[PDB]
């Protein structure tokens, strides 16, 4: 009995392990980029160009 | 913020999700023995009526 | 260094460096021409949008998959739409990057081959590999056994596996999937009043098919209520205002997975596939298959659908067995950390297509022990 | 969308929670229960032992 | 030191340090190589599970007993097989520890020889003796007569001995087992609609058989009751459920045993093969051969065959004669339990081939005074 669950319980580990230990692999794709704001200062333009 | 939240109620529900698994695989192996019990319980009363019959004749 | 792990899929491409929790970059699979004139000059008009720029500017184009079932009908846009992952989502050169695509089981050999030739030579990855989309499923799940039931947006296949031995004979591929079910959906919307026909207005019908609908319990039961009462009439904002009401509307669609009579096909539903599927299996490791079934993809995010399919395997199956359904909460992208988790591994390091052996035997390398 | 997300990953932690407290009372079940199998098995034993002597003599 | 009692058998083996009451490890003895094609990387897949391990992978391997009718026919299986049996399940080194296996009467030479000739090179034990499988079952009795019939899985033989004489005249050996009860099972079951095929499921019939069949008293009566009523009914459930009924097939398939005409054999039955065997012994030991038969082996398990034999030899033989029949309960470990026993003697010690006789000699020593 100790042998047939020591089996399932080895076999599970390698699993766990790879689908666990991977994932430190990289985590920070969560983090988001700057996203930054004007308030009111990048209004340095007038109607002049605007195809380029 | 409620990322934040959102993540630590994750990290608890994969950790209880183990814990759960663990004990149903606890089960499974005590299914297996009571099995494994009732049919020793058989085996033995169908040999003790045979040499029940044995004995008297 | 590390390896790219790309994956076309039909719908949604997901790609990464492996060794990571999830994609890079997740966008979908368009690629669409400019159909007006165009009269101001010096806008900077380009001759077609790919990925995720074509869904702001869809008003004003013809959005066209490139990818119909799993198989690839039209390999200029897919080269495309490979160039625009590899050089502006992940922004790094194929050239110092192994790369591991990932096919449906049972496709044309020429659409493999091809896959491989392109990305030897106009890429120029230093090797490439082919692995099928079910294996990794069951990689994420972190089993060993289990039946997986894929059902992507292109094509629905259900590939068992024991122990690592997979049953190449056991493979049963349907090709009903998300699109026909956003095309059933757009066709039944029309007994309402609201007509939906350009191809642009698909997305608006796939919205709303992923925001409302939901796999109903049990079907009759469902059929009698929204009937008779209205606390089903769920409503929701089109791009320009005028709201819509959907009414039963929103369990019929996601029903035609078990019923494929409603949009013509003959095949049994999902729920009778995988059972036909375990019963090619061998009679001693029905058991095993019957408690480890797994779900993935995105057609089976649907609210309710791991309720129905217990129910309906339950129901065809034997009394004594155990009938369970693993439904992971990131379904979606489970092959993707499948896809990961394998090429992070070791073991898997030799198995690569390298540049050599397929200057030496050709495209056709694949077919060969570098499955 | 991130609140209704935490409501619903909290509604799935606490069913698991309940799913594992109902196994491990199980499991506690079959356990008394395999330890009752195990008694019962020593005593078919000791039975055994004895009916085999008697019908030897 | 303790000395090793193996004994392969066909079917299962039986082993164990001399002296004790049981063997210490029983184990089928089947080796499988796995079969389909196997996906999952890294998982360990080994080329052959051996013993007891491929009775639970039976699922995709296809088991092959080395060991067909006593003698061997494959002997890289059976090398494997006993290096199992050394090393893993009784863990001590062959270097240190003499052994004694048991082989069936009437085997061809070759194979005795090709026996010794692996247990001294490639084992490389300290001396080795290779006994006759009945004489060793007398011994687990305690007599020092009688006639033993040896109903094991591969061949029935049937050795007659008195006061320790043994009648090389008398020895009657069938090649009907336990395996061929098996296969005829297997091939009436077909008769309800059970059709099990593949070599794994052979296992599952092995099963059934061992459960639920038992040997009638009265043949013809129990076909016309069977045929009437339904209390012989028995159920039994599959290793997937869907329980299966075995009616008349209980008693028919170890009744073949008795008319070997069922399975196309031309012999008589193990009930009229025992008289013959006595009958050719000498006019004055036919009486205590008469009242000292002995049962052994595993097939002579089935419930209610002690009976069915004492009145088959009781019609057969002089009615003033007393027949009887000894049963012993521990009857499938018969053998073992002599060889411990025998292995045990101080008489015995000298016995034993010396590694140095066979160095002189070569493997035909085996035939020479040391038998
Ligand atoms: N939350 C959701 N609810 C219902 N359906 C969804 C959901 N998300 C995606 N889908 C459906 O799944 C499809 C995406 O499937 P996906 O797994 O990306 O396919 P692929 O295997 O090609 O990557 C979409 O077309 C959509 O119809
Ligand atoms: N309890 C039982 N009832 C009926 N048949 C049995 C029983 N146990 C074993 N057998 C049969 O006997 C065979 C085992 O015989 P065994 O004595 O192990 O052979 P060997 O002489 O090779 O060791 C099995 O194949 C099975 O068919
Ligand atoms: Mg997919
Ligand atoms: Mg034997």
Same mark, same amino acid.
């Given at each position: ?52 | 913020?409620? $990322? ?12 209880? @999700?183990?814990?759960?698994? #663990?004990? &149903? !695989?606890?089960? $499974? ?12 319980? @058989?085996?033995?009363?169908? #040999?003790? &009526? !045979? ?7 | ?61 013809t959005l066209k998959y490139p990818i119909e079932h799993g198989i690839i009908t039209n390999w200029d846009d897919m080269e495309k739409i490979w160039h625009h992952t590899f050089y502006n989502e992940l922004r790094v050169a194929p050239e110092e990057h192994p790369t ?23 890429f120029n990855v230093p090797a490439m590999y082919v692995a099928i989309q079910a294996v990794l499923s069951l990689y994420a799940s972190g089993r060993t056994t289990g039946i997986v039931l894929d059902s992507g947006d292109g094509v629905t296949h259900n590939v068992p ?211």
């Open positions: 009995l100790g042998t047939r669950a020591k089996e399932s319980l080895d076999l599970r580990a390698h699993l766990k392990q790879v689908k666990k230990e991977d994932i430190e692999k990289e985590n920070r794709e969560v983090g988001d980029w700057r996203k930054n704001i004007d308030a009111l200062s990048g209004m340095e333009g007038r109607k002049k160009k605007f195809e380029g | 913020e409620a $990322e934040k939240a959102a993540d630590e109620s994750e990290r608890g529900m994969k950790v209880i @999700e183990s814990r759960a698994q #663990k004990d &149903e !695989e606890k089960m $499974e192996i005590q299914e297996i023995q009571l099995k494994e019990a009732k049919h020793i319980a @058989e085996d033995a009363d169908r #040999k003790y &009526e !045979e040499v029940a019959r044995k004995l008297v004749i | 260094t590390t390896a790219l792990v790309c994956d076309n899929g039909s719908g949604l491409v997901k790609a990464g460096f492996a060794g990571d929790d999830a994609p890079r970059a997740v966008f979908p699979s368009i690629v669409g021409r400019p159909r007006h004139q165009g009269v101001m000059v010096g806008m900077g008009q380009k001759d077609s949008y790919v990925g995720d720029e074509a869904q702001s500017k869809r008003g004003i184009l591991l695509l990932t096919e449906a089981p049972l496709n044309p050999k020429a659409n493999r081959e091809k896959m491989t030739q392109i990305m030897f030579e106009t596996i024991y122990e690592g031995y997979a049953l190449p004979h056991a493979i049963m591929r349907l090709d009903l999937a998300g699109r026909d079910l956003t095309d059933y959906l757009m066709k039944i919307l029309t007994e309402r009043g609201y007509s939906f026909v350009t191809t642009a207005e698909r997305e608006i019908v796939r919205d709303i098919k992923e925001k409302l609908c939901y796999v109903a319990l049990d079907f009759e039961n469902e059929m009698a209520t929204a009937a008779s009462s209205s606390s089903l009439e769920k409503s929701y904002e089109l791009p320009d205002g005028q709201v819509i009401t959907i009414g039963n509307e929103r369990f019929r669609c996601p029903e035609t997975l078990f019923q494929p009579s409603f949009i013509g096909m003959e095949s049994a539903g999902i729920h009778e596939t995988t059972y036909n599927s375990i019963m090619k299996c061998d009679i001693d490791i029905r058991k095993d298959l019957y408690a480890n079934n797994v779900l993935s993809g995105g057609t089976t995010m649907y609210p309710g659908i791991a309720d129905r399919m217990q129910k309906e395997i339950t129901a065809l199956a034997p009394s004594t067995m155990k009938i369970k359904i693993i439904a992971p909460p990131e379904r979606k992208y489970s092959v993707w950390i499948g896809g990961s988790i394998l090429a992070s591994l070791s073991t898997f390091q030799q198995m690569w297509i390298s540049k050599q052996e397929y200057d030496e035997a050709g495209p056709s390398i694949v077919h060969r022990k570098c499955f």
